[PDB]
Amino acid sequence: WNNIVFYSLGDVNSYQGGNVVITQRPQFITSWRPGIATVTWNQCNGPGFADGFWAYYREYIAWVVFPKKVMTQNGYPLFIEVHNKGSWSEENTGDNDSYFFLKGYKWDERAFDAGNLCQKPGETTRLTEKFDDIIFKVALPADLPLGDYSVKIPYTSGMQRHFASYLGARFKIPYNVAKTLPRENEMLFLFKNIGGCRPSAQSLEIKHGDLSINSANNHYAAQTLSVSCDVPANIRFMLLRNTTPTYSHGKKFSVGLGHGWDSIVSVNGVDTGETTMRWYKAGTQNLTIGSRLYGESSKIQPGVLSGSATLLMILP
Amino acid sequence: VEFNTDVLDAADKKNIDFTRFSEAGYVLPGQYLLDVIVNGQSISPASLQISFVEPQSSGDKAEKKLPQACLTSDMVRLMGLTAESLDKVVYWHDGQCADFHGLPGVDIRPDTGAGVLRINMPQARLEYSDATWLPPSRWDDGIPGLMLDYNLNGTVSRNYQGGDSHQFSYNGTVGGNLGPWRLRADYQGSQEQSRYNGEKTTNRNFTWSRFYLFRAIPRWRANLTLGENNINSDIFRSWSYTGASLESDDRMLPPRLRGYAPQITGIAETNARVVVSQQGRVLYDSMVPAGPFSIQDLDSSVRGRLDVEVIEQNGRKKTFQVDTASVPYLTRPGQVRYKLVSGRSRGYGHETEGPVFATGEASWGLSNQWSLYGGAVLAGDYNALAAGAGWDLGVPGTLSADITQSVARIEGERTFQGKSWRLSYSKRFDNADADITFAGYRFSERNYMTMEQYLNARYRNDYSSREKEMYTVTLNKNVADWNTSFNLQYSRQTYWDIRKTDYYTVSVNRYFNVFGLQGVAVGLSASRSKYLGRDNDSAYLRISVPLGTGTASYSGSMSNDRYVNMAGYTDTFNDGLDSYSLNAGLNSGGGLTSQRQINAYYSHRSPLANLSANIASLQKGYTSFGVSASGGATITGKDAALHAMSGGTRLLVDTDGVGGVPVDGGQVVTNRWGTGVVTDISSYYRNTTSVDLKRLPDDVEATRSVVESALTEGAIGYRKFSVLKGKRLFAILRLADGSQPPFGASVTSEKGRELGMVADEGLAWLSGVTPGETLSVNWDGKIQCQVNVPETAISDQQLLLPCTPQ
Amino acid sequence: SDVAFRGNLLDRPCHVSGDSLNKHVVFKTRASRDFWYPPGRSPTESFVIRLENCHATAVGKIVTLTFKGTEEAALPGHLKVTGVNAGRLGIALLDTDGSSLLKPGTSHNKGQGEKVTGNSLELPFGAYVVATPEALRTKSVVPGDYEATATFELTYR
Amino acid sequence: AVSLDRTRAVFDGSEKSMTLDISNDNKQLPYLAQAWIENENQEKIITGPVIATPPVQRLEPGAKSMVRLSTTPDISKLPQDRESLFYFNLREIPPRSEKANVLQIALQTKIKLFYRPAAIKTRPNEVWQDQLILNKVSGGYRIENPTPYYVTVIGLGGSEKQAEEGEFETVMLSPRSEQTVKSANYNTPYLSYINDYGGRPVLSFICNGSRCSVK
């Protein structure tokens, strides 16, 4: 006969990496747990209650299995990278969404155990068995948005028992019956994105003082702004309308500075509003945004002007 | 220069310094602050030391000459002149005026009315520098000390079966740099303890995960490396080892020398003269060679029309329209790249050793846009030879391929030999956005053994995971309506005598707005893993609409019969820098159970260290409340400090005495000792450290703010701040006879500092006076008198002062 | 993601016209013919002063003209001249109507003689040097160089 | 000539020193200039409240010149409930020629100063000129000033044809003062004055015989 019942742990853990930049990658501890197990399987074909007066077969192995691909807050596919398997034995290369490693430490033992061989799942036992630890890392994706994310980890941690009648019974347990079981063992990651595209100033101070009227008519005053990143991608931006213009001028983004003065802006020579550029390497550029100081259609009513606008950057 | 001495509102006719200062106004031999500008740019935005003295070198009959800038040696050595080529300033002292008798064509116009110093000179006498392409002079790398940065989390918990709450994370990367040699060792630890009714167990763990030291070289543009690390997957996979490594660093080179744009291949007749203008400014005017020419020296920023005007030798001209897209390639001809790594292999344990190797990996590009790459990994019992080329054909895309001849002689006497070929293919930016960014094809056999496979089969003896042959492609295409970048995909695998598990993944990204603002991004994906009998159809769903301080978030996901739901309102605060995450969720599992979770969070970016809090509570897992501590510190430098998490570079702003000054960059405030440190900076850039001038408190003031320096990775830059207060007072200077001296005479200090001048009734309002010194008044071309200001004087007082001669 | 704004201000450039830069009028008269004989006078010199503006509906309500200078001690209403004639001559300045021999420090009555030529306000005048009676009868006037420059306070209203 | 951009020099209580650029209109010869600040009783206060730092500087043909104006605790000891009017004066020094009997023209210009304290500070779009109440004596309109600032008017007329074209003498006042100005009786007085910008806001009154204000 071959009666096999399973043991599943009751541990929930915490862990934290902190704040990592998108160009960098993290590493993480996958600690082995010698916790309290709970029975989640009740099968019996041979004897019901344990007697242990005949030297029957026994072995005890561990069982930790993890899925190869999960999801995040916005549903992104989290590619779990395997870094170092430890001193264990990873098998089943024909799978694509589950890892399969086992550890044979207790084997070919003759049994002399009394009691009950096949019991109910509502039972817990104290077992202290520490083993080899595993250390990993993760190949995270490139295109990630900003904000804070809470990554939930679905896993299992535990293994199986064995009671046969003879020495030399290499029994194997299928994986579909193992993966169809419910999930209880711990989930815990929290992360906030730093980002890889951050401009230079982010305070946007543009200033110009007093002058005459005739010089001011169709005058120009410039201001430069740079931005630096290190990932090759196609970056765009958008200029938001804050104020309102008096006259109609069409394609020209004229910002109303008050008193009948709609100063047209200069996106490095032309009033186009927004453009599109690409990055093939790392680095930075420079981008001088000025504006033409003509805002009144010759019925000149000048005053103290402090009109505003808002330009932000859109990720690809 | 002669002026009118009579026309002035003064009751006293003593104007000997009134004609003199007016006449002396060509070059004034005094001490002011000027900004030295060389050929348009500036070497110093806040140059304080600018000295002027009358030259008595050149003797004459009249001795009426022009004084120049009496420069010292620091500002002439920080400007970047090639001092070994032309030695005309290395022999000049600070006592006399630096004369320019040895070199031609450079003129100097010192104007103290504009606060500038213009120098116009040719490029053949000096080197080149800007915000990009810093000179090879060493920067501020002094007293590195130690660098700590902790990231720890303390939290509570409770399960369905009772409760237990003691959970602690323990990580950080400490290490001490010593000059150019810089060290960092990252520790790994934790603290767990559980308290049930019948059992009280706990465990503690700590280990030295990774300890490492490094030093960079600017002469050969390579970074040396000693210790344990991993190599990225170019051809071979990733693997652990211990030892030496010579790797890449291409931060120093300029983008004109790095990138090269394709030029005009027009061949008209001879050695012509090109003229290219953008807005009415010639960016390039030189003599091209005879016949065919190609200018790859110009890779600047263009955003428009550029009229390529050619001036031939006979006088012929031709105008044609060139685009703004000048299509720069990723291949780099003339530059090589290399990996010279050696040492021992690292297993899984901390003291796990192995065999000794010697590996050489290099790549070389020829200048016909073709590029080869060869690798020679050589160990004591395992050898693999790699070679291969890559080239862009232009209009059909680009290709690259390589062969890897590997021999493997294991300890169990089994020699395996194989030559495997892998080819990579891609595609340029097409018209209808046809973009194959990668297309691989890896040919293998059952007789293979990689280095990781050699180390696992040699000691752990596993004889599995054999791959036969496969193909992949990566196509992505957008359309100019509905904002959708279609990326339909297919990837296929197969092992040796193990099944396929062929994949099928598709995608569609909608972007629009109905009854709301634009910014709603809807990206949708669906995946399928095809086995012989099983096809797992997974798909992700979401609803995300932002409104700035509010964002309704939802998340749907179903791998295999397990649909999960989420609901949230996560966004920032009104300042935009503070944040909180708030979301609920619904979980439906396949095993007849419906689960629910509710998680709350709030963060706070304090300048000493970043802190946050979290609330997590789900079904069967209860009351997991947390708190986090993360930040950084630097001890045994100039002064100890506390900051928020670094990734390799930090600059040290020194504002002594003031505890509350806000600086820019990351808005860090200082301490009671008066020291500060910024974090968000990068290597080899123009770093303008200015304080928040309008956010100053009313106890302190600021004289000047802009200081300039360029830092590298792992160095700490010290920045001294000369901001001090100045007392202002009205002093009535009286002579020895009783009479008043002729007003209009300027007062110089003891350290060479001009402050102001004497008014009509022998009075002199002066600001910035230090109490205790002995001042100097100057008229008729020399020093005339001295007065001794007492230490009991404070600002805004009326003091009668007696004159004593020197 | 920040406020793109520019705080500006401006002002009206109230000024004088630059056409009257060459106002070096001279007195090429003889001091022993026109200043020794008892007609004690030189031939008068005329000068018009332009001042550009934006609006000229008012003249004296924007800038008020008043003149001053080193007054002659032995001559009321006349100024002291420098040079070889130390207090021997007196400059008599006529107004825009050319009748009133006003004082160095009193102002001209506005409303008359102010040429409103568009935005430029023309102002013609007349001035001649009179002889001081302490040196006219005794004929002690030294024939030579005599430099004179009077201030003009153009007070803005 | 010499370009003068300021219409009225207005100083605020928050700022300790303001700035002013003056430039050259002549392109044929360089120049020199000297300045001073006077007061209400018209004397050269060289130990005044505000001290202009450069006394004399050389001006090139067509170039510009700067001047900074430092301030002393006497402004603080003075009452901040009202403004402090002053008169700064400019004088240029031209290069003396060598010809005989040269009548060079010396130019002197006066333009007004205005220190406003921070306790009675004015917002950038604040108009207090509509707060002014005007009464009428038989033969002249008397002006009542409840404002803590200096007021200045240059025009009055029943229509706009007699507002900027009608003859009216310049009448200034002091803070919280009152006086009687001789003027004819008008149904709708068109108060055309010069504001802080320098323009002409023609505030058309709504009067009640001897009670004139704005709605």
Author numbering:
A (entry chain G): 21 to 336
B (entry chain C): 1 to 644, 647 to 808
C (entry chain K): 22 to 178
D (entry chain D): 1 to 215
Sentences from the paper on this structure:
In the CU pathway, a dedicated chaperone facilitates the folding of pilus subunits in the periplasm and an integral outer membrane (OM) protein termed the usher provides the assembly platform and secretion channel for the pilus fiber. Periplasmic chaperone–subunit complexes are then recruited to the OM usher (PapC for P pili, FimD for type 1 pili) for subunit assembly into pili and secretion of the pilus fiber to the cell surface. Ushers contain five domains: a central 24-stranded ß-barrel domain that inserts into the OM to form the secretion channel, an internal plug domain that forms the channel gate, a periplasmic N-terminal domain (NTD) that functions in subunit recruitment, and two tandem periplasmic C-terminal domains (CTD1 and CTD2) that function in pilus assembly and secretion. Using cryo-electron microscopy (EM), we determined structures of the activated PapC usher in the process of secreting two- and three-subunit P pilus assembly intermediates.
To generate a two-subunit intermediate, we replaced the PapK NTE with the NTE from PapF (PapKF-NTE) and deleted papE and papF, resulting in a ∆EF P pilus tip fiber composed only of PapK bound to PapG. In the ∆EF cryo-EM structures (Conformers II and III), the PapF subunit is not present and instead PapK is directly engaged in DSE (by its engineered PapF NTE) with the pilin domain of PapG. The lectin domain of PapG in Conformers II and III has not yet fully transited through the usher channel and the PapG pilin domain is still located on the periplasmic side of the usher. In the Conformer III ∆EF structure, PapC CTD2 undergoes another dramatic shift, moving 28 Å toward the N-terminal end of the first lobe of PapD, next to where the usher NTD is bound, forming a PapC NTD–PapD–PapC CTD2 interface. The usher’s other periplasmic domains also undergo conformational changes in Conformer III compared to Conformer II. The PapC NTD moves significantly away from the plug domain, shifting laterally by ~21 Å. The movements of PapC NTD and CTD2 cause the bound PapDK to move laterally, leading to a slight upward movement of the PapG adhesin. In Conformer III, CTD2 also makes direct contact with the N-terminal tail region of the NTD: CTD2 residues P744, F745, and W781 interact with NTD residues L8 and I16 in a hydrophobic network. Comparison of ∆EF Conformer III with the PapCDG crystal structure reveals significant additional changes that likely reflect requirements for the expulsion of the plug domain and activation of the usher. (5) CTD2 then shifts toward the N-terminal end of the first lobe of PapD, forming an NTD–chaperone-CTD2 interface, which is accompanied by a counter movement of the NTD and bound chaperone–subunit complex toward the CTDs (Conformer III).
